[PDB]
Amino acid sequence: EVKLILYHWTHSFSSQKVRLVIAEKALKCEEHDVSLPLSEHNEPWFMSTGEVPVLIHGENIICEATQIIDYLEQTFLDERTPRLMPDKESMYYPRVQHYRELLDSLPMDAYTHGCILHPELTVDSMIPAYATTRIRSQIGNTSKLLDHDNVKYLKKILDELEKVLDQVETELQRRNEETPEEGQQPWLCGESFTLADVSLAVTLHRLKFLGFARRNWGNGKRPNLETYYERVLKRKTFNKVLG
Amino acid sequence: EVKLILYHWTHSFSSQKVRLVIAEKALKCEEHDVSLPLSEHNEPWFMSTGEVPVLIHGENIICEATQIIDYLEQTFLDERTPRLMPDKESMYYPRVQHYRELLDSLPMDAYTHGCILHPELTVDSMIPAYATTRIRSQIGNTSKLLDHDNVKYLKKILDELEKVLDQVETELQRRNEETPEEGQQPWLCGESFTLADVSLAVTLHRLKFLGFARRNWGNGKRPNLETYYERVLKRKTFNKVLG
């Protein structure tokens, strides 16, 4: 009876995760993309403010992406609805809860800023040369803070990204050992798809866009992570949201 | 071209101020009241959570009532649009800014809670006896924090309310002296209607509902404040929003 009403930016990292949770929970929702198509100068989304999506479910109006996702989990508990979180006392809950926080803490806003401002560190980046040169000209005429110390701050957080991926690479390795090679493979934290998988999937996809995917995984580096990303790419909910 | 889209609860104090700002700025907006009419037990709004309205203006999605109001002021600057804030260097800006904060700091949530839980301190309260007895029964079976120390905390903040109204009473007195008795009277902070007047108007109206209006003003107590409330009641924008 009640309608779900999401207001989001199509190319917003926080918003993307929310959409996927909806897709994973198989909920009918009236998504309202507010992002403008292209402007006079086709001002893309990778060029700061602090804007966040908002969900409206009847009397409840939830802002912030993490709050909306948690709301969805608690609100919709129909028997058909799939839960992206395990039981509080489940052996999986510590893992889902630990790795979900580990991935959400990554400063994606900073990674984006660095990708444009310093393409020297990127590999097969989907952000073009015109973007880099364009914003450098904007700087010359004049978020600067997210650049922070220039190339020195950027390399620092990119190495921290490797450390986080190292944890995830290890976790996936554990899954492959426990699971027989033939048979249904499990996700990051157990066989069922969880909120931790959502954060991981979206994070990896965004990294691919920034060109940091090649240097982190692939070519036999972090083989389990590479396999994971390929598996999640084929997933139907993933393809629908992140098409 | 772009549509304003407000999502609000009809009987939400924070939301009410936003609506009035829209009405004062004479902006066409698509207000979406999310409040449910009446439920099975007609659960009224004075019976906690922390929910806040959300504005959607094209790409911008602003939450929190104070942020939305500020956004409206900066966003819509058409020559026809009336500004509820003076120039930053205007003599009125310190006053509008001081008294706007003084009124927004009042814990209306607490005052509401006290009105129901302790009608002994109220006078001609619009909350009925069934409400008081109803929630006391709910307590017996079991925001408790906003009750805090029971009647001792409640009296404390009600006296602090008198102190704030004392400041406002003094400010209005100043206006009457400066203005000739015959001629257009000015509002709290100057002749033009400001955001300070919005906060003051809504605050007074809500107090009336809680029954704390009689003991604070009226019967010759705070005569300028009484006159103010009568004047703002007749105002068209006020009648439309707080009808």
Author numbering:
A (entry chain A), B (entry chain A): 23 to 69, 73 to 167, 194 to 294
Question: What does the paper behind this entry write?
Answer:
Charcot–Marie–Tooth disease (CMT) is the most common inherited peripheral polyneuropathy in humans, and its different subtypes are linked to mutations in dozens of different genes. Mutations in ganglioside‐induced differentiation‐associated protein 1 (GDAP1) cause two types of CMT, demyelinating CMT4A and axonal CMT2K. The GDAP1‐linked CMT genotypes are mainly missense point mutations. Structural analysis of GDAP1 indicates that CMT may arise from disruption of specific intra‐ and intermolecular interaction networks, leading to alterations in GDAP1 structure and stability, and, eventually, insufficient motor and sensory neuron function.
Using GDAP1 variant crystal structures, we identify a side‐chain interaction network between helices ⍺3, ⍺6, and ⍺7, which is affected by CMT mutations, as well as a hinge in the long helix ⍺6, which is linked to structural flexibility.
